Design a binder for this molecule. Structure first.
Ligand SMILES: O=C(CO)[C@H](O)[C@H](O)COP(=O)(O)O
Ligand SMILES: O=C(CO)[C@H](O)[C@H](O)COP(=O)(O)O
Lengths: 195, 195
């Protein structure tokens, strides 16, 4: 009575909804909002930023990051050099611009030269094999997109409490999901489904 | 009747208050919260994240960034490789951790090896000469800290509207300052003072 079955969650994800994603069933886990990169709108980005740390990340497969010439920031969360999609952005940081950059990272027609680096989005490199190889939120995002038949790209950020800025643990995530009509899943659940 | 005189603003800054900082007097300017890096607490970081884009940046002088071995992210806003202060942080992204990292970047006793890279704070390299050479929010932050007799390090983020995630222009910044008891200045004002 807490977690949504995966096949129902995937349909929500396919229809451009966020999912609240926990590591497993533990009450002390902190929740992330995750949705498909190609489906994030200005309004949905505004929502994500409003209720999160605002350190908005875009999980991509290593292969896709390689195609887009987004190398690891250095040579643990696998940050690439940051970026903005050049055409149609100004400040880069706005909900509109962050959403556009995120959709562009998912778009299979995007080219390396279409992006300015550094920028205001944080792409992440998901390991090949995804959740079977690393049970990270990065791998979860790309896995969800893959299972949904979408481009292997997601967008994520950590839920934070309005009251005090503490990250939302399970109880608060359940409350947030109820208030905003967002389904909750956990990574263990996803691993079980694909295994 | 909008902008606080610089000497009064500096005293507020010295006492660990944020300032709302605009480029000049134009009503279309978007506002940033800026405060001294060494003075930011868990609670003040929570506040900054709550009302901003959450893409929290820490302006440092080039000399200080060089000392801390924080090279430009690539070889426009001058991002360095991101970082977390290692000791006393866990997730890096929490208000507590982001605040600690920010204070640590200001601390003249901090050493390069004290930080993990990449991380969850975005240090920025302010150009030598600060606002006399580049009228950026990066240079403004380091200038304010310098004028306040503090370490040449600040912390900044863009104010965003709760309603729709649009960046706060002047009118909304005035409202925000009144609601939260935060003074407003502009960069042109600061340039005039130092010139
Ligand atoms: O959720 C997170 C860590 O709690 C962050 O969103 C991170 O950017 C990606 O997570 P991971 O390192 O688990 O892939
Ligand atoms: O305020 C900003 C741009 O509007 C951002 O905070 C940026 O990180 C630093 O600004 P600048 O490039 O002006 O130094």
């Amino acid at each position: 009575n807490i977690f949504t079955p995966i096949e129902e969650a995937l349909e929500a994800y396919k229809n451009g909804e966020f999912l609240i994603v926990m590591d497993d069933e533990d009450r002390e886990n902190e929740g992330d909002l995750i949705m498909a990169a190609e489906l994030i709108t200005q309004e949905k980005m505004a929502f994500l930023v409003r209720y999160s740390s605002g350190y908005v990340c875009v999980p991509l497969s290593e292969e896709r990051a390689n195609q887009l010439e987004l190398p690891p920031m250095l040579a643990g969360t696998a940050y690439t050099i940051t970026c903005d999609f050049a055409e149609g952005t100004t400040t880069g940081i706005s909900a509109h611009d962050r959403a556009l950059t995120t959709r562009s990272l998912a778009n299979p027609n995007s080219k390396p030269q279409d992006f300015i680096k550094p920028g205001h989005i944080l792409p992440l490199r998901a390991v090949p094999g995804l959740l079977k190889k690393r049970r990270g939120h990065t791998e979860a995002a790309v896995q969800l997109s893959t299972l949904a038949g979408l481009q292997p790209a997601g967008v994520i950020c950590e839920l934070v409490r309005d009251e005090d800025g503490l990250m939302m643990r399970l109880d608060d995530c359940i409350q947030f999901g109820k208030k905003h009509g967002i389904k909750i899943i956990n990574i263990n659940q996803l691993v079980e489904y694909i295994s």
